[PDB]
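Fold this sequence, please.
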Amino acid sequence: KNSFSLGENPNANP
């Protein structure tokens, strides 16, 4: 079972 890497966008990013 391949674990997917979540790309979370930074707090208050322009």
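The two ends are 35 Å apart (CA to CA). The CA atoms of residues 7 and 13 lie 14 Å apart.
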